[PDB]
Amino acid sequence: NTYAQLPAVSLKNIEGKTVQTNKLENAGKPMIISFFATNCKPCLRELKAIQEVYADWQDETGVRLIAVSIDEGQNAQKVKPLADGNGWEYEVLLDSNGDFKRAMNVSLIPAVFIVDGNGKIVYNHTGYTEGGEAELIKKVRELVKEGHHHHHH
């Protein structure tokens, strides 16, 4: 099991398939969910920074990024073209209900939810706004240290 400890909400992925967040699993690797609007660039401070060093992070913890649209499906139709145009190397989710943002509470974007390798929510940082990136990598390191080699101590 490696979900994201998400509420029972039905969302739409890039494939146009109805995926429930409660059952949302990557592949046994930790996940970072970035909550962002349907038209933002500098607001995606974490997403941009992580994107640049994304391979390094995958190299280590193998963490992936989940780009989720805090909008409705009709408006979120612009999220995926953003992903393609900008050059995002991760999964993108479109909220087709608009309740997912409410369920996780998006006080201020960007909102960061980090999921541990055990598929549980380990870190939350909503609306850090600049400088928060430091905390992103820091928690990543926490996961690395917890991942002991061939042992748990």
TrEMBL record:
Keywords, comma-separated and alphabetical: Signal
Domain Thioredoxin: 1-145
GO molecular function, one term: antioxidant activity
Top-rank lineage group of the source organism: Bacteria
One Pfam family this sequence matches: AhpC-TSA
The protein's name in its UniProt record: Thioredoxin domain-containing protein
Taxonomic source organism: Porphyromonas gingivalis (strain ATCC BAA-308 / W83)
Lineage: Bacteria, Pseudomonadati, Bacteroidota, Bacteroidia, Bacteroidales
